[PDB]
Amino acid sequence: MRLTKFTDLALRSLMRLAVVRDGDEPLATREVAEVVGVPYTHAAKAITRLQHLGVVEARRGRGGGLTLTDLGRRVSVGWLVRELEGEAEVVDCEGDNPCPLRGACRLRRALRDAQEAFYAALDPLTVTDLVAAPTGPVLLGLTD
Amino acid sequence: MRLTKFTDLALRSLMRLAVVRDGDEPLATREVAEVVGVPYTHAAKAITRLQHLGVVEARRGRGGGLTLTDLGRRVSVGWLVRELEGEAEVVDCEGDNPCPLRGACRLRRALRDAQEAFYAALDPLTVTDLVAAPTGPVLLGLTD
DNA sequence: AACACGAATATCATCTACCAATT
DNA sequence: AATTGGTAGATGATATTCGTGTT
Ligand code: SF4
Ligand code: SF4
């Protein structure tokens, strides 16, 4: 059981954008992707996703890059992981070869509850929490 | 975020073995794999794993198949999912391209706690619970 | 001088098949 | 008449790339 590199990459991007100095300069996607150490092209897809979600402002030209939106700073990590991962079932009951235990599986209820426990354990935290010490100092130091 | 078909397949096998009538006849791996609808060869690897864990008795010849061990009926689903999935991190921080936020990532602590919440939501249930109504009746009906 | 949107290419983690060795 | 242990082919999900179209 593992989170997509898409989701973790997008959260890296959100954190980098969250440590930015208030009104220093908008960040180009390349510089964020290189600071957090991910391929630029994957980061750009994550940026388009985050922009659709409303957490990241992506100025498109004439001077301008990436800004953390008001929303971006107060949204919870649980909501972000739900929207970036897609809350898809933790098991593929109705795949190409569906399980005969559909419609009367207590394991499916159990795994439903466990996945909700995961997401709810993420639900309190915001992105400002994720960039508190010692993470914030590290991200800032990494800009050189 | 998805559970391996190995783990879900093995839990299907455990459930099928749990509904077996007390001293009816030991189950061949083929008949279990076909009742629960998984490829036989994958099921055999899961069976070897379960036997190493001590939950499944696999008589090797001269007449004999699969039995749920005393342990098998009282073990928790959380323990089973831990041993079959391997408690590997839900993110690959030290992969081929390690994250620069190792050693000072609050997201890693958050995801650690969320994964523990998952496993602990599974920790109460046993395998006898998973085959209670309506699952047990369905598994039994499926034997024809 | 950047971000967005859609079509492949690559990759790798697991799904799966298989042969030989017991028993 | 079955289960076990090591070896690759299969696969499909996603990690990644890229070209064109805005802006
Ligand atoms: S055993 Fe239950 S939870 Fe697992 S794949 Fe089948 S229906 Fe889904
Ligand atoms: S951002 Fe944190 S949790 Fe994510 S891969 Fe990097 S160190 Fe791990």
Numbering used by the authors:
A (entry chain A), B (entry chain B): 1 to 144
Which statements did the authors publish about this structure?
The principal regulatory target of this TF is, in most organisms, the hmp gene, which encodes a flavohemoglobin that converts NO to nitrate (NO3−) or nitrous oxide (N2O) under aerobic or anaerobic conditions, respectively. Tightest binding was observed for hmpA1, followed by nsrR and hmpA2.25 In the presence of NO, the ScNsrR [4Fe-4S] cluster is rapidly lost, causing the dissociation of the protein-DNA complex.
Here, we report the 3.0 Å resolution X-ray structure of ScNsrR complexed with a 23-bp hmpA1 operator fragment and use it, alongside the structures referred to above, to establish what determines the DNA binding specificity among the three structurally-related iron-sulfur Rrf2 family proteins IscR, RsrR and NsrR. The 23 bp hmpA1 operator fragment has a B-DNA conformation. The double helix runs almost straight through the central 11 bp region and bends at its extremes around α-helix 3 of each of the NsrR subunits. The distance between phosphate P atoms across the minor groove (MiG) decreases from 12.6 Å at the center of the fragment to 9.6 Å between nucleotides 0 and + 4 of the other strand. The His42-Nδ1 and His52-Nε2 atoms interact with the respective 5’-phosphate groups of nucleotides +4 and −7 in opposite strands. There are only a few specific interactions between ScNsrR amino acid side chains and the nucleobases of the hmpA1 operator. The 58–61 and 66 wing residues bind edge-on to the MiG, with Arg60 making the most contacts to the DNA. There are few structural changes in [4Fe-4S]-ScNsrR upon its binding to the hmpA1 operator.
